[PDB]
Amino acid sequence: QKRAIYPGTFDPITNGHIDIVTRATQMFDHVILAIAASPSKKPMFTLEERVALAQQATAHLGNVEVVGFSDLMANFARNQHATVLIRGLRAVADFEYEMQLAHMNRHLMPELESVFLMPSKEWSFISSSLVKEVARHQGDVTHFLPENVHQALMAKLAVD
Amino acid sequence: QKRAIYPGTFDPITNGHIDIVTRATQMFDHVILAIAASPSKKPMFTLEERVALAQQATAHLGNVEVVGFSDLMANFARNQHATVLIRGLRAVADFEYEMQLAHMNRHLMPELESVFLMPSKEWSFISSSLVKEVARHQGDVTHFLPENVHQALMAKL
Amino acid sequence: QKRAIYPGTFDPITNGHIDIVTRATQMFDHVILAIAASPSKKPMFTLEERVALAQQATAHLGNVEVVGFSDLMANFARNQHATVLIRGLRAVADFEYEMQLAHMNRHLMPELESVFLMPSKEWSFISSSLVKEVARHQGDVTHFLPENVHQALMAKL
Amino acid sequence: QKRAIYPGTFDPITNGHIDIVTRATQMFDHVILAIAASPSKKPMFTLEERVALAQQATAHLGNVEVVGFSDLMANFARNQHATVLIRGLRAVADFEYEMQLAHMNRHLMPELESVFLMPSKEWSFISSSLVKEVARHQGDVTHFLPENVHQALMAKL
Amino acid sequence: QKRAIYPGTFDPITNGHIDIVTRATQMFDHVILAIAASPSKKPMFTLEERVALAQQATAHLGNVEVVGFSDLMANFARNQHATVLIRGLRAVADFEYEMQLAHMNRHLMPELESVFLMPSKEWSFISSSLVKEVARHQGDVTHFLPENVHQALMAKLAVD
Amino acid sequence: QKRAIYPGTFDPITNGHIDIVTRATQMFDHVILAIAASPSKKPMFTLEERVALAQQATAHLGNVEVVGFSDLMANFARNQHATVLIRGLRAVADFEYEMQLAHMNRHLMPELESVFLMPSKEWSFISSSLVKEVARHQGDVTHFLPENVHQALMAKLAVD
C-alpha cells in the first residue's frame, strides 16, 4: 500500500534516526530509508559506508529498504513512487527550515505528503553534527549510536 | 485498516481543519474527527452544534467519521482503536507546545503515534480564534469557513 | 498626505508605545493612534480613560491624532483613509502571531499595508501586562510610563 | 552564605520543580522555594495548601526552605537577603518571555541575579497546566508528581 | 520626499523580492533596490548580472532605481541620503538575525529607520538559497522567479 | 568553593562577554574564562592574542583567570575540576543550539552544571561575528569592545 521515503544524509545514522524510522515502519507498509550523496557537505562517511551502516542498523526492521540516491530527493521519490515523506521533528529542530523544505517539496511533487514524527525524549536534543564534532574532539558519543556505527566512527577517527 | 484520530475543540471547524482532515484521509484508511467538549475553553458552540457542523462540512469525505467526546483523549483514542494521532503543523505554529502535548499523549498511550501534517499555504495563517474575533465585529470571514459554519456563526452572533 | 494608523488596546499606553508612534511620525505625514475598546480583554481602563491618557501623553507630537473605536479595525482604517498600518516589532515578539494578524488584516483591507517598526533597546522588553502586574504589587513602574499614566494607574489601584 | 530564591506559583509543585530546586541546592548554600499567592491565576490550591505540599515534597532537601508570599517578588527576595534568582529553562521554553521577566526583575532589584537552570530530559516537556488538564479527565499523572501532591490533586478533583 | 533603500544580495532577485519592493514603492516616494557585491558568499551571478536582472524585473516600477554597492550598507545608505531601510519579514525568516541587523544598523546610522514589510502568502516560505539548490539539482523553480531570471538561471546552470 | 568555567572562542572578547563574566564572578568564587583554540573557525585573532586581550580586559576582576585550551571543553573542565558551566542567554541567541550543547555537556560530564546568565539590555542584540563583519567593512564598532580590543582590531584590519 503506502510507500514512504525517509531521506537524509545519514552521516552516520544515529539512534534518533533509528527511532524515527522504527515509528515510520509501524505506520506505513514500506519505508525507503534514502541516503543522499550530498558531496557539498563533504560527508565524514562515503555513500557506500553510510548505506552499509544504515543497512546493518535497520536489518531487524523487515519493511525498511536502504538505498542511496544522488539526484534531487523529489525526483528520486517520484521515480520510486513514494507518496509519504517522513521527517523528524524534535525540540532542537530548525523548525522554519523544515517548513521551507516541506513547502518546496510540495511544490515539486504535490503527490508526496510530508509527515512529521517525533522521537523519544532521549533523542530530542542532539544533532548528528554535534555527535561528530564531539567524537572528533575526544568525547564519548557511544550512547547516541548503534554499535556498528560506533565501531565505524572509532575506526574513521583513528585513521583520519 | 489503519485508523487515525484527529482531535480538537473545532469551535468551529474551519477550512484549515478541512484541509488537514482531507490530507489525513489520503494517507489513512479511516479518520475519526473527534471533537472534545472542552468546557474549560468556554466554547462558542455547544458540543452537539460543533459535531453537527463538522458532520455537514465533511459529509462528502467518505472515510471521515465525526464524533464527540468528553473524556481523556488518549482513552477515547484507544477505545476507537486508533493508532495514529493527527496534528496540524505550520510555520506559525507553537511547535514546542505541540511537542509537550505529543509527549504527554505518548505517556498516556504509547501505541498512539502522533503525526504532524502541514496545511496548504492558503490556510497557513488562519485560526478559529482569529475568525471569531473578526466575526464579532461583523467582518467578512466567509473565505475561511464552510458555508454551513458561516451561517451558524452569523446566528450565534 | 500619507496617513498611517497605529491601533491597539493601549491599556495603558506605555513608553514603548510612545517610542513606536514617534518613529511612525518621522516617516508618515499623519499618524492616527487608534484605541480599540477591546471588551473581550476586560481592560483595566475604560476607552474614554485610555483615549484621554494617550491624548495627554502624545500632546506634543503634532502629527499624532488619538481616537477610540469599537468596530472592525480594518473598517475603521478605511474610514480614516489610512493606507499604512503600524505594528511594533522586537526580538521578544511572537512574530508569527503578528504574521497571522497581518494576513487577516490584509484579507479584510488589502490596501492597508502593515509596517513593523522596532522600538529602542530601552523598551525592548516592556509590556502593558508586565507593568500592570508589578503595579498591582506596588512596585515602582514610573520608569516605563508617561507621568500622567503613572498617576492614573496609582488611582485605579 | 550564598542565598538563592526559586519563586513561582507551584500550583502544584511537580517533579520538574523538584529537579530544578535540587540542582539549585548543589550550587547554592541556601535555596528559598518561594510560592506566590498569585490570585490573578485563580490557582487550584490555596497558598497554604501549596506551601504544605512543597514542604513535604522537599522535606529531605536540607538546604531548601519553603515559604509563601503575596507581595512583589523582588521585595520579598531583598527581604530574604537573596542575591540569586533561580529560573527553569528548557528547549520548549518561551525564553523571550523569561527574558522580559528577568529584565523587569533586574529593574526592580539589580542585585538579584537571574540564573537559568535546565531540568533533566525526563522533565523537559512537563508543566503544572498539562498535569492538571490530564488529571481533570482522570488520566494517570502519578509519574509526574510527588506522591503527596498526587493525593492532594485526587482530593481537589 | 522619503528615500528608502531595499538592500540585499539579490542572487538572483525572486518573486518574493519583487513583492516586497512593490509594496515599498506604494509606501515611499523613491526606493533604491541596492545590490551588495558580497564576494564572500561567492554569488551565483556577478554583480553586473544581478543588477541587470533586477533592472529588467523592476522596469515597470517607475520609482525603483537599481544600483550595486560594495561598501558597508549603512555607509552607502548615508552617502545616498536614505532615511528608510526596507526589510522583508516572512514566516520562515531568521527573525533574531533580522533584529540583530536592525540594531546594528541603528547603531551605525540612527537616522536610517528599519521598516519590515510582509510578502504575500505565496512567497512566505522559500529562500533564494533553496531556489538555487533545487535548480542546481534539477528541480523546477520557474514559479518563484521572474521570466528574465528564469532564463538567466537556466543558462547559468547549463554552462556551469 | 565553586569553580566555574566560562568557555568560548572569544574572538575577540566583547563588552557582552565582559558583562557575563562580571555577573559570574559576583555569583561564584572562581571563574575560569576559557578560550577554545577553534582552528576550524579560522579565528581572526590567534589564541595567544585572544588570551592576552581577555587578560587585559578582565584584569580588574580579581577572581577571573584566563586560560586557553585546545581539547574538548568538557575534558578540560573535568581536568580543571570545574562544577559550573557559564553560558550567556540573550534575546538574539540561537536558543535551541544552546539547549543542544547543554544536554551534550551534561551527557559528557554530569557533574558540570550549565547555568545561563543574561546580559544587560545594551548587549542583548549583537554577535561578535557581526561586530567583525561590520568592522571589516568599515563600520564603527568601538561601542561594543573594550578599548584594548578596539586597538587590536584596528591594527589587525589595517595590516590584513
Side-chain angles (χ1 to χ4, degrees), chain F residues 108-131:
Chain F
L108 293 167
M109 186 176 169
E111 66 266 32
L112 178 65
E113 194 71 40
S114 283
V115 306
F116 299 82
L117 302 169
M118 183 184 73
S120 66
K121 296 192 295 298
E122 192 173 13
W123 316 122
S124 292
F125 307 100
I126 304 296
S127 65
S128 66
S129 294
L130 191 51
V131 168

mmCIF file of all heavy atoms in Angstrom, chain F residues 108-131:
data_model
loop_
_atom_site.group_PDB
_atom_site.id
_atom_site.type_symbol
_atom_site.label_atom_id
_atom_site.label_comp_id
_atom_site.label_asym_id
_atom_site.label_seq_id
_atom_site.Cartn_x
_atom_site.Cartn_y
_atom_site.Cartn_z
ATOM 1 N N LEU F 108 28.319 14.368 28.739
ATOM 2 C CA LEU F 108 29.763 14.163 28.809
ATOM 3 C C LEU F 108 30.273 14.269 30.238
ATOM 4 O O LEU F 108 31.214 13.566 30.625
ATOM 5 C CB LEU F 108 30.459 15.218 27.945
ATOM 6 C CG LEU F 108 30.209 15.108 26.439
ATOM 7 C CD1 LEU F 108 30.668 16.370 25.700
ATOM 8 C CD2 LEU F 108 30.933 13.865 25.894
ATOM 9 N N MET F 109 29.702 15.179 31.016
ATOM 10 C CA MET F 109 30.198 15.487 32.359
ATOM 11 C C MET F 109 29.013 15.930 33.193
ATOM 12 O O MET F 109 28.728 17.128 33.322
ATOM 13 C CB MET F 109 31.259 16.584 32.299
ATOM 14 C CG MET F 109 31.910 16.851 33.654
ATOM 15 S SD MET F 109 33.241 18.074 33.488
ATOM 16 C CE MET F 109 33.572 18.433 35.230
ATOM 17 N N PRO F 110 28.272 14.987 33.776
ATOM 18 C CA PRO F 110 27.060 15.371 34.509
ATOM 19 C C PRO F 110 27.342 16.187 35.747
ATOM 20 O O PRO F 110 26.444 16.896 36.213
ATOM 21 C CB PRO F 110 26.380 14.034 34.836
ATOM 22 C CG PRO F 110 27.449 12.999 34.670
ATOM 23 C CD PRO F 110 28.405 13.526 33.627
ATOM 24 N N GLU F 111 28.562 16.129 36.282
ATOM 25 C CA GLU F 111 28.922 16.921 37.449
ATOM 26 C C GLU F 111 29.179 18.389 37.119
ATOM 27 O O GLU F 111 29.455 19.174 38.034
ATOM 28 C CB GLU F 111 30.140 16.303 38.142
ATOM 29 C CG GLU F 111 31.431 16.333 37.335
ATOM 30 C CD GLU F 111 31.708 15.066 36.505
ATOM 31 O OE1 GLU F 111 30.767 14.394 36.018
ATOM 32 O OE2 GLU F 111 32.907 14.753 36.327
ATOM 33 N N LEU F 112 29.083 18.784 35.848
ATOM 34 C CA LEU F 112 29.273 20.168 35.422
ATOM 35 C C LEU F 112 27.888 20.727 35.125
ATOM 36 O O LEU F 112 27.212 20.259 34.207
ATOM 37 C CB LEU F 112 30.152 20.177 34.171
ATOM 38 C CG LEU F 112 30.440 21.545 33.533
ATOM 39 C CD1 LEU F 112 31.268 22.416 34.488
ATOM 40 C CD2 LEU F 112 31.146 21.365 32.195
ATOM 41 N N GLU F 113 27.445 21.702 35.912
ATOM 42 C CA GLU F 113 26.077 22.203 35.798
ATOM 43 C C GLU F 113 26.042 23.438 34.905
ATOM 44 O O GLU F 113 26.663 24.454 35.230
ATOM 45 C CB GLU F 113 25.503 22.552 37.170
ATOM 46 C CG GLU F 113 23.995 22.755 37.156
ATOM 47 C CD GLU F 113 23.243 21.447 36.944
ATOM 48 O OE1 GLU F 113 23.652 20.412 37.517
ATOM 49 O OE2 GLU F 113 22.241 21.443 36.215
ATOM 50 N N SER F 114 25.294 23.360 33.797
ATOM 51 C CA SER F 114 25.106 24.536 32.952
ATOM 52 C C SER F 114 24.239 25.558 33.673
ATOM 53 O O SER F 114 23.193 25.221 34.240
ATOM 54 C CB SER F 114 24.432 24.169 31.628
ATOM 55 O OG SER F 114 25.345 23.569 30.730
ATOM 56 N N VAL F 115 24.671 26.812 33.647
ATOM 57 C CA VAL F 115 23.871 27.912 34.153
ATOM 58 C C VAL F 115 23.892 29.018 33.115
ATOM 59 O O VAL F 115 24.930 29.301 32.510
ATOM 60 C CB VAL F 115 24.368 28.425 35.516
ATOM 61 C CG1 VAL F 115 24.457 27.300 36.490
ATOM 62 C CG2 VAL F 115 25.702 29.088 35.393
ATOM 63 N N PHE F 116 22.742 29.630 32.892
ATOM 64 C CA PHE F 116 22.624 30.689 31.899
ATOM 65 C C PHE F 116 22.432 32.023 32.593
ATOM 66 O O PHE F 116 21.569 32.154 33.467
ATOM 67 C CB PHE F 116 21.473 30.400 30.932
ATOM 68 C CG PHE F 116 21.651 29.128 30.167
ATOM 69 C CD1 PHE F 116 21.306 27.912 30.732
ATOM 70 C CD2 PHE F 116 22.192 29.145 28.894
ATOM 71 C CE1 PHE F 116 21.487 26.730 30.033
ATOM 72 C CE2 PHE F 116 22.383 27.964 28.187
ATOM 73 C CZ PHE F 116 22.032 26.757 28.755
ATOM 74 N N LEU F 117 23.252 33.007 32.215
ATOM 75 C CA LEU F 117 23.124 34.368 32.714
ATOM 76 C C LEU F 117 22.744 35.269 31.548
ATOM 77 O O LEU F 117 23.053 34.970 30.388
ATOM 78 C CB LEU F 117 24.451 34.856 33.319
ATOM 79 C CG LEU F 117 24.989 33.988 34.457
ATOM 80 C CD1 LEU F 117 26.421 34.375 34.830
ATOM 81 C CD2 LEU F 117 24.078 34.114 35.655
ATOM 82 N N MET F 118 22.073 36.388 31.864
ATOM 83 C CA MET F 118 21.541 37.288 30.853
ATOM 84 C C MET F 118 22.252 38.630 30.913
ATOM 85 O O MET F 118 22.330 39.231 31.988
ATOM 86 C CB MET F 118 20.049 37.494 31.106
ATOM 87 C CG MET F 118 19.372 38.367 30.080
ATOM 88 S SD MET F 118 17.642 38.680 30.483
ATOM 89 C CE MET F 118 17.851 39.828 31.843
ATOM 90 N N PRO F 119 22.763 39.146 29.804
ATOM 91 C CA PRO F 119 23.489 40.417 29.847
ATOM 92 C C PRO F 119 22.529 41.597 29.932
ATOM 93 O O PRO F 119 21.304 41.455 29.872
ATOM 94 C CB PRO F 119 24.234 40.425 28.508
ATOM 95 C CG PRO F 119 23.309 39.713 27.594
ATOM 96 C CD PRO F 119 22.678 38.614 28.431
ATOM 97 N N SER F 120 23.111 42.780 30.091
ATOM 98 C CA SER F 120 22.301 43.985 30.126
ATOM 99 C C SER F 120 21.617 44.197 28.777
ATOM 100 O O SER F 120 22.025 43.647 27.748
ATOM 101 C CB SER F 120 23.183 45.192 30.424
ATOM 102 O OG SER F 120 24.065 45.405 29.345
ATOM 103 N N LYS F 121 20.552 45.005 28.793
ATOM 104 C CA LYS F 121 19.846 45.329 27.551
ATOM 105 C C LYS F 121 20.812 45.826 26.488
ATOM 106 O O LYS F 121 20.683 45.479 25.305
ATOM 107 C CB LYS F 121 18.763 46.383 27.804
ATOM 108 C CG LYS F 121 17.650 45.924 28.729
ATOM 109 C CD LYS F 121 16.452 46.888 28.708
ATOM 110 C CE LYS F 121 16.807 48.259 29.266
ATOM 111 N NZ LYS F 121 17.225 48.170 30.698
ATOM 112 N N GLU F 122 21.808 46.615 26.897
ATOM 113 C CA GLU F 122 22.757 47.200 25.956
ATOM 114 C C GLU F 122 23.456 46.147 25.107
ATOM 115 O O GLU F 122 23.781 46.404 23.941
ATOM 116 C CB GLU F 122 23.794 47.999 26.748
ATOM 117 C CG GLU F 122 24.670 48.897 25.922
ATOM 118 C CD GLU F 122 25.555 49.769 26.781
ATOM 119 O OE1 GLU F 122 25.665 49.506 27.999
ATOM 120 O OE2 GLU F 122 26.144 50.720 26.237
ATOM 121 N N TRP F 123 23.711 44.957 25.661
ATOM 122 C CA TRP F 123 24.480 43.930 24.968
ATOM 123 C C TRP F 123 23.619 42.750 24.550
ATOM 124 O O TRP F 123 24.135 41.647 24.357
ATOM 125 C CB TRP F 123 25.671 43.450 25.811
ATOM 126 C CG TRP F 123 26.415 44.567 26.451
ATOM 127 C CD1 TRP F 123 26.631 44.746 27.786
ATOM 128 C CD2 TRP F 123 27.016 45.689 25.791
ATOM 129 N NE1 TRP F 123 27.334 45.904 28.000
ATOM 130 C CE2 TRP F 123 27.578 46.506 26.793
ATOM 131 C CE3 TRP F 123 27.127 46.086 24.450
ATOM 132 C CZ2 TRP F 123 28.250 47.696 26.498
ATOM 133 C CZ3 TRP F 123 27.790 47.269 24.161
ATOM 134 C CH2 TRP F 123 28.343 48.057 25.181
ATOM 135 N N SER F 124 22.319 42.962 24.394
ATOM 136 C CA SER F 124 21.398 41.868 24.142
ATOM 137 C C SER F 124 21.282 41.489 22.676
ATOM 138 O O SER F 124 20.640 40.475 22.377
ATOM 139 C CB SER F 124 19.995 42.235 24.630
ATOM 140 O OG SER F 124 19.977 42.329 26.029
ATOM 141 N N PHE F 125 21.862 42.256 21.750
ATOM 142 C CA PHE F 125 21.425 42.126 20.370
ATOM 143 C C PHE F 125 22.492 41.885 19.324
ATOM 144 O O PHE F 125 22.132 41.757 18.153
ATOM 145 C CB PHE F 125 20.605 43.351 19.930
ATOM 146 C CG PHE F 125 19.462 43.662 20.840
ATOM 147 C CD1 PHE F 125 19.566 44.660 21.791
ATOM 148 C CD2 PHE F 125 18.275 42.955 20.738
ATOM 149 C CE1 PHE F 125 18.506 44.937 22.642
ATOM 150 C CE2 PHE F 125 17.216 43.228 21.580
ATOM 151 C CZ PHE F 125 17.333 44.216 22.538
ATOM 152 N N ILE F 126 23.771 41.832 19.679
ATOM 153 C CA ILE F 126 24.833 41.900 18.679
ATOM 154 C C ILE F 126 25.809 40.753 18.888
ATOM 155 O O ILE F 126 26.331 40.568 19.993
ATOM 156 C CB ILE F 126 25.576 43.249 18.718
ATOM 157 C CG1 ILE F 126 24.599 44.414 18.549
ATOM 158 C CG2 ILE F 126 26.628 43.309 17.628
ATOM 159 C CD1 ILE F 126 23.903 44.441 17.213
ATOM 160 N N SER F 127 26.068 39.998 17.828
ATOM 161 C CA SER F 127 27.017 38.899 17.900
ATOM 162 C C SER F 127 28.421 39.398 17.574
ATOM 163 O O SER F 127 28.603 40.413 16.892
ATOM 164 C CB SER F 127 26.638 37.802 16.906
ATOM 165 O OG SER F 127 26.751 38.275 15.578
ATOM 166 N N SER F 128 29.426 38.679 18.073
ATOM 167 C CA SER F 128 30.798 39.063 17.765
ATOM 168 C C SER F 128 31.111 38.872 16.286
ATOM 169 O O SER F 128 31.956 39.582 15.728
ATOM 170 C CB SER F 128 31.771 38.268 18.626
ATOM 171 O OG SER F 128 31.719 36.899 18.283
ATOM 172 N N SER F 129 30.434 37.928 15.633
ATOM 173 C CA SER F 129 30.620 37.754 14.198
ATOM 174 C C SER F 129 30.145 38.980 13.428
ATOM 175 O O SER F 129 30.801 39.409 12.472
ATOM 176 C CB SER F 129 29.907 36.490 13.720
ATOM 177 O OG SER F 129 30.504 35.336 14.280
ATOM 178 N N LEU F 130 29.013 39.564 13.830
ATOM 179 C CA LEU F 130 28.561 40.779 13.166
ATOM 180 C C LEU F 130 29.492 41.947 13.466
ATOM 181 O O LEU F 130 29.757 42.779 12.593
ATOM 182 C CB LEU F 130 27.115 41.099 13.569
ATOM 183 C CG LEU F 130 26.397 42.197 12.768
ATOM 184 C CD1 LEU F 130 26.482 41.965 11.258
ATOM 185 C CD2 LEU F 130 24.947 42.350 13.221
ATOM 186 N N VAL F 131 30.024 42.013 14.682
ATOM 187 C CA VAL F 131 30.997 43.052 15.010
ATOM 188 C C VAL F 131 32.192 42.994 14.056
ATOM 189 O O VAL F 131 32.608 44.012 13.486
ATOM 190 C CB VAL F 131 31.421 42.942 16.483
ATOM 191 C CG1 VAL F 131 32.638 43.808 16.739
ATOM 192 C CG2 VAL F 131 30.258 43.349 17.396
#
